[PDB]
Structure formats: C-alpha cells, structure tokens
Amino acid sequence: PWADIMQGPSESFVDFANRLIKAVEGSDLPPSARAPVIIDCFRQKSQPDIQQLIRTAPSTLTTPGEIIKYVLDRQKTA
Amino acid sequence: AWTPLEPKLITRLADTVRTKGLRSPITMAEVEALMSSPLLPHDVTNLMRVILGPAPYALWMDAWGVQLQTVIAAATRDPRHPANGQGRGERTNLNRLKGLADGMVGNPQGQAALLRPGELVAITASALQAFREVARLAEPWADIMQGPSESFVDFANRLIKAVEGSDLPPSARAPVIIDCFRQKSQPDIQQLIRTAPSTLTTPGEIIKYVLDRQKTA
Amino acid sequence: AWTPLEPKLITRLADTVRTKGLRSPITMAEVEALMSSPLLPHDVTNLMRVILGPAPYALWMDAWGVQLQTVIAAATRDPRHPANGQGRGERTNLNRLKGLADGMVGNPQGQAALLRPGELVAITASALQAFREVARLAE
Amino acid sequence: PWADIMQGPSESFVDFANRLIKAVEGSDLPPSARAPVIIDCFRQKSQPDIQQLIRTAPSTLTTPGEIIKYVLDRQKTA
Amino acid sequence: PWADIMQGPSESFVDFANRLIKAVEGSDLPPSARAPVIIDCFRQKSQPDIQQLIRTAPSTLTTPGEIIKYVLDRQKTA
Amino acid sequence: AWTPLEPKLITRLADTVRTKGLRSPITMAEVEALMSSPLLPHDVTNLMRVILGPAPYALWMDAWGVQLQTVIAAATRDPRHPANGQGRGERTNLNRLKGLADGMVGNPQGQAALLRPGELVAITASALQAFREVARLAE
Amino acid sequence: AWTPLEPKLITRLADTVRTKGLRSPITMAEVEALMSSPLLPHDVTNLMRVILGPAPYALWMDAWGVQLQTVIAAATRDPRHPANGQGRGERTNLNRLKGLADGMVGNPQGQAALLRPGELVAITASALQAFREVARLAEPWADIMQGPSESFVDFANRLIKAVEGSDLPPSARAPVIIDCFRQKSQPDIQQLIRTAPSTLTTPGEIIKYVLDRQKTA
Amino acid sequence: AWTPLEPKLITRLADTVRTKGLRSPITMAEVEALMSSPLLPHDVTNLMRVILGPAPYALWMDAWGVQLQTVIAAATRDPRHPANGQGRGERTNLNRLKGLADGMVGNPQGQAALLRPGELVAITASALQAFREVARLAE
Amino acid sequence: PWADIMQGPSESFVDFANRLIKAVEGSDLPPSARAPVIIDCFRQKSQPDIQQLIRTAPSTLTTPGEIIKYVLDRQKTA
C-alpha cells in the first residue's frame, strides 16, 4: 500500500524513493494521478529533515525527478 | 432624497466602539462599512456625535476641519476637482463642505439637494481620515517582536496594524514593514526570508512566500 | 449610476469571515453571493479592505494583480476580449482595470462611467480567483 | 451646571473633558460662546498640575481639541 | 552693577526683571547695547528653572518684553 | 525501417546495471556499446525504462529534457544544425525531438520515417549525457 | 601614465584597518581619502589585497562583482553611460571593468591606456560600495538607543550611519531617521521634539532644533 | 581636467577637525586653505563627507542648500551673475549647482566640463558659509 | 600545505577561512583551480557542525564568499 510508506529513521532517500515509486506505479491509481501523489508523498513522508529541506526550496519543484535531484544535492551527508 | 442611517446599525456601532475601542481593526472595519455610501455632512456629523464621546468628538471636529482645509487647498490648486466646476462660480467653499452654506444649515434635504457627488465623497474620505487620526491620538511599531509561540499571520497582522496606524508618511510604510519582517520574526523565519531565491519587494509577497515554505508545527 | 453595497451585508460577511475563517464553504458561498453583480474596482477593493485583515489584504492585492496581469496577457493574445474593442484605441491597460487610469482614481462615479461590463466581469472573476488563492494560502 | 465642574483628584483628563464638554454643549449658552468657555474652563479647572501644563504651552492653544491633544501628549503618566 | 545681578532663590521673576532693567538702563552702556544685554542676562541669570524655560522656547524671543511675557505665561505657579 | 534492439542484450545490460551499478566504467562502456547506432526516441525511452529503476528513470527524464533544451537553444543559435534545415520550415521543435510531434506519438515506424539522422544523433548524444549526469547523481 | 599609490600610505591604512577594524568611521574616512582619485582595477585590487585579510578579500571580490554587474545592467539600460559610447562598439563589458579584457590582464599601463574616466569612476564607486557591504557583513538601526550619558550629536551620527549603511531603500531612510529620533533619544529629547511649535520634516531640521533648545549640562 | 585633492591633506584636515573641533580658528584656517582653488560639487561634497561626522554632514547639506538657494535668488535678481549668461538659456538651475543636472550626476569629469568658473566660485563660497553656520551651530 | 589545513575544535570560522584562502592562493595551483579547491575544502574540512550547515543549504553556494556569508549568518553563536 503506497499510503503506508514512510522513510525509516536509518533509510537513505534513494531507497525510500525507489520503494515509493514502485508502490505507486504498481497500484490501482490512474496514470494521470501518479506524479502528484508521488510528489505529495515525498513532501509529507520522508522524515522531517527532508520535509523541511523540500519545504524551503527557493525554486518550485513540479516533478518527482526534480525533487529527487534537489534532495540528493542538498542532503545532509551522514 | 435623503434617507437616514438605521438607528439599529448606529446603536450596534456605538456599542462596538464602547467595548472594542476606537483603534481595533474590527471597529475600523465597521466604520468603513457604515462609511460605504457617500454621506451628507449632517449624517457624518450626527454619526460622530452618537458614536464618539464628547472629547473625542471635539478632537474629531478639529481633525475633520483640518483635512477639509487640505482638500480645499488641493481644490484651489486644481480646477478639475470632482467637487469643483469648470467656471469660477462652482468653486466649493468650506461653508458648503461643512454644511454651513446657505440653504443647508440644519436641513439635510436641502443639503442633499445642492451637494455634488464629488463633494460627498470628498467629505466622506476627509471624515474617515479624521477618524483615523483621532483614533490614533486618543489611545509602537519598532517594539513589535514575533513571540516564540505566535504564528506568523498574527505577527504580520499586528505589525501592519501598528505601522499603518502610526505617524509615518504613507510612502514609508511598505519598506518599514518589509525591513521589520526581516529583522523581527524570530530567526527561523529570518533565515527563511534571507534564503529566498527570488527577491521579495512587497509585504504581500513576503507573506505568501513564508506561508508557503513555513515549518508546519 | 453607482450604488454602494449595504454596510449591513458587509458587516455580516466580515463577522462570517471572522468566525468561520477564509476557507469554509459557507464563507466562499457568502463571497460568491456578494460577488453576484459586477463590482467596480472601488467596490471590491473596499470590500477586501473591510473583510480581510492587513496581511491577508496585502496577499490579496498581490494575487489580484497577478491574475489581472494574466487576464491582460490573454487580452493582448485575443483582440475579441469583452473588455477590449475592435480597434487598437480600446485596448485595456492595467491602470483601467485596477482603477488607476485617468478620471477614475478615488472616484467611483467616474469609474462606473468609463468602465465596460466586460471589464467589470473580468475584474470580478479575477478578484474571486485571487480570494481563493489567498484563502488556500493563509491556512 | 457647567460652572461647577471640577476635575477630581483621581479622575483622568479625558473623562473630565467629556463631562465638561457635555455639560457646556447641553446648556443655555449661545452656540458661539461654547468654545471660549470650554477653553477657559480647561484652564481654571483641571487641577493645578494640568493647569501649569496648559499655562507653560510654548504654542498658543486656541481650540478645545488642540488643548486636549497637547495635554494627552505631555501628561504625567500615572 | 548689572553684571552682578542674580535672581534670588525666593525672588519672583518680575522683581528680578525690574531690578535688572533698572541697573542696565541706569548704567554706562550705549543705548544700542541695552536690549541684547538684558536678553542675555535673562538667559544666563534667572535660576535654572527659568533658564530651561527660556531655553526650550519653541519660538525665538528677540525682545525683553516678549521674554517677560513668555515667562509670565508658562511660569511654575508657586 | 525500424528494427528493435534485442531483448537479450537489453536483459544483459539490465543485469549489468543491477550488479555493477550505474557508475562503473564497465557499465558506461556497455551503454556506449548499446548507444552505437542512432536510436529513435522510442528506443532510448524504452531502454531507460527497462534498465533504470523508477526514481533514476524520473531523474533521467528530467536531465534528458534539460539537455535537449540546451540543444534546441544551440539550434536556434545556429541555422546550420544537422537537425535543422536552411529554411525556417525545417526548424526542429522539442515535440519532434522527444517524439511528441504529430505522427510520432507511440508509433516508432512513423518516428523513423520523419526523423533526420542529425536529429537522431543529437537525441542520442543528449541521452548519453543525461545518463552520465544521473549516474553521477544517484551515487 | 600610471602612478602607483605610496606603500607608506597603504601601510598606514593597513594598520588602521588592523587596529580600528573595518567599520569604524575613521577607517571609512581613510578609505574615502585613498579613494579620491579614480583608480584603475589593478590599483583597487592590490589595495584590497593588502589591507584586507583573505576571507574579507574573498567577500569583497564577490560584492565588487555583484555591484559591477548592477552597473553593467544600468549601462545596458541607458546608452548614455559615461563609461559607454554612442555607438554599439563602445559598449563596456565586465571584462573591461574587472580588468580582464584584452591588453589589460596584469598590465596597469595598458589598463590606464584603454580605460575611460567614466569607467574609472564607476569602478571606484562600485569598489567603495562593495567595501561598505563587506564591512557591514564581517562584524542594526532598530536597536540604537541614546545612552543616558551620551550627547545628541553622537547619537545622531551613530543612527544616521547605521540607517544609511543598511538594507533599506534610499527613499525610506529619512522617515525612518525621523521616527527613530522621535521614539529613541531618551524622554527629555523626546518631549523636546514632541513640543515643537513648528513641524520638523527633515533630520537636519530636527537636529538643528534640538541643538538650539537642548538642556545645557 | 579634474584633479582630486590629496588624501594626505584630507586625512590631516580630518584629524585636525577631530582634535581641535569645528570652530577653532586653526580649523577654519585649514578649511580656507583647502578651499583655495574653486572646487567642483563632487569635491566639496566628498570633502564634507570625510571630515564631518554624520549629523554635522546632514546639517551641512541643509545649510549648503539654503545658501545656494539664496545665491540662485540673487541670480534671478541680476542677469549679470558670473554664473549666469546674457541670454535666458544660460540661467543656472540648482540642479547644475548641486551637481544634479544632466551629464553631471556622479561624474566629476563631466562636471568640470560643463561648469563655469563663476559657478565654481559661487558653490565654493556657499559651502564655506554653510560650514561656518554648521560649526557655529554644532557647539 | 593547503591540503593539511583543518578547522580546530576551538577556532572560529573566519580565522579558518583566512588561513585556508591564504595557503591556497599562496601555493602552486593554477589561478583557475583555486575557487573550486577552496569550496571543496570548506565542505570537507571545517568540523562536522559547519559541514552539516553547508550540506543542508537550501540554495546552491558556488563561491567562497557566498559560503562564508551563509555560514556567518547561520552559525551557532557560542
């Protein structure tokens, strides 16, 4: 179930994005509703450090690929 | 034909002024509401007589006279005033604005007969500005800080209220509001505004940006 | 001839916005109600000045300007706008939409004189969309 | 009676001004004699602290509203 | 001697002004030097309460009579 | 005439990407190998759909679009692009590069019909650079 | 012909910056002194290399580039720039302003040959503004109060300095300075300004009035 | 051709003003010394910016403006001013005296080009009188 | 040697930046390789608090001056 996917405390972001995109594209949603759902799940899941990282984006991110690129650039190396 | 304002609305407005005061934004909104249609000098005079106490009413008469005098100076500085006419015989004297001219003293019907719509709207705007002055006088922007637990829209409301209801010129309010958003508004929002990829040049734009990217908590 | 909106309706709408908020469906229905007849820029401006607080009013001025600019771009993209005319002398500038043009600044009577009904309905729809944006943004 | 109105030792100045203007305007005086009477009652009533505050006015106050504004500005906060 | 005249701690201002104008006009000064001397003696003599009262004059006082009138208006009744 | 790439080679390349990763020099060599003949937008799109996971595929779509936009800017900066023609009627739009133009959407045969060899090589180089960017970004 | 600045003056200025800091008014006065004649990019670059440390020098290079870019935007917005010419062949590129153009890299003589006097004065003003920015950054107007023992001219100097060397628009400095004179400047001077029989509408007029009627002590 | 004043002399004068004050006869003598050759508005403005503090500089700007206005009143009262010309096209506006006219704002070279020697000496005398007023006022 | 410069546990950031820029500009590197090296040394040296402060930069910092300004703004006052 896509709506139950959370980014674990120790999980990296690319694994979380892979799992989420997999569960969203392999589901019962229409094809035209996958990108907005993936974006809004990146924003509300993806534990509050990345949540604030996406929130304070000086540019407007309108695609899952752009969000992934931005987060991978500005992520907290740890 | 002259129609008086409802005494029910006037009683409700008087009780609003009695409980909330002269300077509350709800009171100014209510006054703007009852200041919607262009009023005759009789209407505004009786309205301020009823809603204001004796001393605020004296202050308001003074301020209204001063603002009307500024209006008449601008009118003699421009013959195209909506209260004026093209020839010199339509020049508007302060006796006609304050309702003191011939055929108007104490008679609202004759008042409504001889007055122009431009005259009415000028009188109304003058009375509103005078009310604002007296309200600011009867009861500090640079001391306003966003509390640790306060939301941002409340802080913005309080700050814009205190800046617009102050002694600053009209052309100095927006830069002051912006620079107070930037230096007040505790360091999380300070850094949020600082790291703005776009340049924000208006209080509304700053408010929109902060409301978009604020830390939901 | 210009007729102002009742201050009683405006007071009731202001108290509705004060208790229910900006985003409640009852509030949007009430705004749609008071947005029924095409309003002059003076009317909508004073209405938003009274019902909205200072910061939402700033946000609404911004959003209204942006929406009016989109309207003017669509207008220069189509000479058959109900606000435009056929010749180039009837092209509608933003000073005429925001009420800033000559013969309109501060005077609602002259405003109602020079404005077109298409101008009025475009201004009204723009203001409604801006109100929706600000309401979605404030909370 | 307007000529019997004094500012009480504990009364504020706006209350005293309200009471005095009420009693003077709701009396038998001609309309052209109310402002001078209100001014001269502000000067002689309104207990000696405010009396001296009005006396030492570098500007000449020629209106009840101006006197009220001046006194409200320079009054002893207490 | 005019330059030795001070306003006593208990003396009123009209007595001090009388004494000073008497001693200045009944002295060896030229006639065109009496008014400036009287003014500058009002400003530097006339114990610091009246000194500050004259200093903080929103208008410019350019005559002994005007200074006397101003001080008599705004003096501390005591 | 359009001929598809072998699913055996594509399966081997997908397993190479799965075990070695996106950034290994052997993987880039294999991609260069399968990027030898000029591919149609359909071919490269399906290839990246199969060999890349969902999130790297989104990143790659973004990067490919950006690189194609740079190519189209250079093309409008020089009318002698091997994708362009001499007259203005041969100017190449991004709908024709991404395979979105008329007569191309979903049809590889029509795609191969209308596309130019310069168009194909530009699309291919753009896709290779985008793959390099995404590989450098993913790990 | 290019003449270098004296290393004695440069050494004295460097020691001034070392002891007094970047933001002291004496340091800014000394910089204005050594910024009197229009300098070539070589001169200003070496001057900032010598007087500033490494990190302030990096900051200053950044700020100088930004200010020069604003200048070049204004130049492309007006073909009558004293650095520009009338035809398009005299348009001034940033390589010519930063000294990076052909025939100028590392050579001050050729630099002085090809550069215009308008170019020199624009570069100089840009460098001065960049120095001001970096000095304000390396080490707030709304926090300035007149101390209990401080004189009024010192308070006015400090306040005008902090207001003009800040992020406010140019059209918002005078009203802010006035309203800060009125609300800061401890209550004796506050009441002195409040009871002004005339209306003071300029910081200079307020300063003159207060200096006239101040309590000598 | 414009030549700037030595920063060494300006530094010495600034330290003189710092130690002796504004009103000492030695300070006024030094100012008269550095006020010997007719200065352009740029020179006097920067000189007062450097030697005077912020508040005395504001006072001096005010006083300089007032004195220049008196000069311009005397100039419109006499068409034979060494700053004026014979025809009406040489009448000197305050924008030309304060250095605000066209071709002068921020550029000392153009300033020195368009200005008259009578203009320069009038500006200089005005600035000296303004300095005297401010010095008498500050202490 | 520039590649041996670390920000000490007690050292401030402006001193570290001064030392690093000095050692990088006074070295054998080409002029076109100093800014990237200074940036990448700010990112990998400059003990992990400032490392994470630079990592989680919502904007992309592409100049040593911009990095210095950002760090000076958001640094932990201590």
UniProtKB/Swiss-Prot annotation, chains C, F, H:
This is Capsid protein p27, alternate cleaved 1. Homodimer. Homomultimer. Homohexamer. It is found in: Virion. Coiled coil: none annotated. It comes from Rous sarcoma virus subgroup C (strain Prague) (RSV-Pr-C). Residues 42-50, 103-114 are annotated as: Involved in capsid protein dimerization. Self-associates to form the irregular polyhedron core composed of hexamers and pentamers, that encapsulates the genomic RNA-nucleocapsid complex. Assembles as a tube in vitro. Binds to inositol hexakisphosphate (IP6), which allows the assembly of the polyhedral capsid. The lineage of its organism: Viruses, Riboviria, Pararnavirae, Artverviricota, Revtraviricetes. The chain holds residues 249 to 387 of 701 of the full protein.
